[PDB]
């Protein structure tokens, strides 16, 4: 509308476009960890009851 | 408790349920036997016994 209102404008659309956006990587790491540590105590259990089956652990691949 | 105790309780029942029951039927044979040779050996001094009063062994029935 008026030129001062296009300088508000200008001075918000300033202010909203650096708001400290944060570092989401150690936020998301540890999911992908959390993974890894889940998936090794569910292999575990199935190393020690393949071993109650065969007396034995598997052969590897 | 944790799925790999009731993976080592499932190990041990099976072991335990076959401990290679041996066959006890000559080791009870063997006892039936000598209560008839005992038996036997006892019934022949009653004959005899008896042969020393009449001068003949019993009738029969």
Do not use: C
């Amino acid at each position: 509308f008026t030129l001062i209102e296009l300088l508000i404008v200008v001075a918000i659309i300033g202010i909203l476009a650096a708001i400290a956006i944060p570092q989401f990587s150690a936020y998301r790491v540890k999911a992908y960890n959390s993974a890894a540590s889940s998936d090794l105590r569910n292999l575990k259990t199935a190393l020690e009851s393949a071993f109650a089956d065969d007396q034995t652990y598997p052969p590897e691949s």
